[PDB]
Structure 1
Amino acid sequence: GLLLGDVAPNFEANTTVGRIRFHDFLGDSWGILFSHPRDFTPVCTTELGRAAKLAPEFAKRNVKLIALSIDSVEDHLAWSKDINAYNCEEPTEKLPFPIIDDRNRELAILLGMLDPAEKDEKGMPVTARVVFVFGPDKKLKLSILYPATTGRNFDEILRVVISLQLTAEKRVATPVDWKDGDSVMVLPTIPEEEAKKLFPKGVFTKELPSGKKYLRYTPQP
């Protein structure tokens, strides 16, 4: 597995563009490493095709995507023609992000990207649907662990990406169901002095039974 303070290992692995070092791939950009169970599968095809459409948005926001499965690069390159066909693009071998060959399930044990009750006909447990979000400083900023049966929300991946990019920029936080542009919460350890000088668009605090002044809203900084 991997915890929120851990560092993405500079692992070496083979992809659809060749072998790479992890950190060297990222360098000074945010990284999204997501894994999918098998290639030539129906939900995975939707998932990786949804990604390929979102790669422009993830790009201009300084994020690099990269895929991973147990299937070979021989397949990855061929499946991309189907993935491209799904998106009604010209069925090339080229995707806007890479896919890692994890033939031997090395970094899938390293990172805990395994599945229960899912394996190949060869009798080997496959990947699951994980998404690791790393920051420019190579640390784990977020992670989700989804089942093989349950597909992922990529509109949710983009949402928390803007947050992580916003909450690190400003001394704010994003509440539940927060949509891009909605009001953010004021970090509760900030006094009304430094606060009003940070958010000139105003800080708005509700009053609650215990008379604490922590519930403070403010428009997007």
Structure 2
Amino acid sequence: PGGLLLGDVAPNFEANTTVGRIRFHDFLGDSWGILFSHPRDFTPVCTTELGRAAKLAPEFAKRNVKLIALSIDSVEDHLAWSKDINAYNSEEPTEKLPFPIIDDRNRELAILLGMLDPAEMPVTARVVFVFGPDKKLKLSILYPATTGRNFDEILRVVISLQLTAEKRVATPVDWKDGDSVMVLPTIPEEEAKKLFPKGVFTKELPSGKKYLRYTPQP
């Protein structure tokens, strides 16, 4: 994926965006943050992705999640590209978007974030990074520019991450919002009993270990 591992604290870079200069940590503050990477402006899939992210912005904001895009082009191109994005959404073709777009025409940020090789459109600059309020990397997604992301999945994964952070539960494969969840393996039996009064169900396995524990979404 990117050059950061899970648990890595995000680079506190300074950059100029469509809304002005920003210091990464300042911008994030006490909110979760999603950084979408794109190779260049005025490009097919990336345009459909930013238009969808713009429409979905309110769903994220109410979950204390800030959105921010990065693209390897200048701010003026970013501004012009926003009218196209707005127009694609069947909206007034304005240069205003619900989130900023960082200017990385110099490719210095793409190198910092580990999604570009100087010895090589920069097709590699495609990572979606999710950071928590603690500035650490929580999740990463690396789809090529020819495969559009699925935003219902991005939203689903955010709800999951927040569930773990606040309720101390893990979500199983293909979990849908509202489904049973799993007790964190580090939670003792004595403890899980009190923490989750709704009930903890341990699936019996051949090994006899008790790690497959389900509990209603708290």
- Using the size of structure 2 for normalisation, the TM-score is 0.93
Q: Which piece of structure 1 moves more, 97-106 or 200-209?
A: 200-209
Percent sequence identity is 100
Q: Which piece of structure 1 moves more, 143-152 or 31-40?
A: 143-152
Cα distance in 2, alignment partners of residues 190 and 40 from structure 1: 49
Q: Which piece of structure 1 moves more, 11-20 or 152-161?
A: 152-161
Moved over 6 A (4+): none
Q: 1:191 to 1:33 in 2, by over 3 A?
A: same
Q: Deviations over 1:159-182 (max 9, x none)?
A: 111111110111210111111111
Is the CA contact (8 Å cut-off) linking 2:17 and 2:100 kept in structure 1? yes
Cα distance in 1, alignment partners of residues 118 and 106 from structure 2: 17
Cα distance in 1, alignment partners of residues 190 and 205 from structure 2: 21
**Cα RMSD after superposing both structures:** 1.8
Q: 1:17 to 1:93 in 2, by over 3 A?
A: same
User: What count of residue pairs does the alignment treat as equivalent?
Assistant: 215
Is the CA contact (8 Å cut-off) linking 1:15 and 1:99 kept in structure 2? yes
Q: 1:69 to 1:200 in 2, by over 3 A?
A: same
Cα distance in 2, alignment partners of residues 189 and 67 from structure 1: 36
Is the CA contact (8 Å cut-off) linking 1:185 and 1:217 kept in structure 2? yes
Q: Deviations over 1:35-85 (max 9, x none)?
A: 112111111111001100111011000010000111111111111111011
Is the CA contact (8 Å cut-off) linking 2:110 and 2:125 kept in structure 1? no
Q: Which piece of structure 1 moves more, 9-18 or 126-135?
A: 126-135
Q: 1:150 to 1:33 in 2, by over 3 A?
A: same
Is the CA contact (8 Å cut-off) linking 2:19 and 2:100 kept in structure 1? yes
Q: Which piece of structure 1 moves more, 151-160 or 19-28?
A: 151-160
Residue 4 of structure 1, CA deviation: 1.2
Please list every run of 5 or more consecutive structure 1 residues that lacks an aligned counterpart in the other structure: 118-123
Question: Corresponding residue for 1:89?
Answer: 91
Instruction: Please state which structure has a larger fraction of its residues in strand.
Output: 1
Residue 195 of structure 1, CA deviation: 1.4
The question of 1:2 aligning with 2:4 is answered: yes
Is the CA contact (8 Å cut-off) linking 1:134 and 1:140 kept in structure 2? yes
Cα distance in 1, alignment partners of residues 14 and 103 from structure 2: 11
Q: 1:85 to 1:116 in 2, by over 3 A?
A: farther
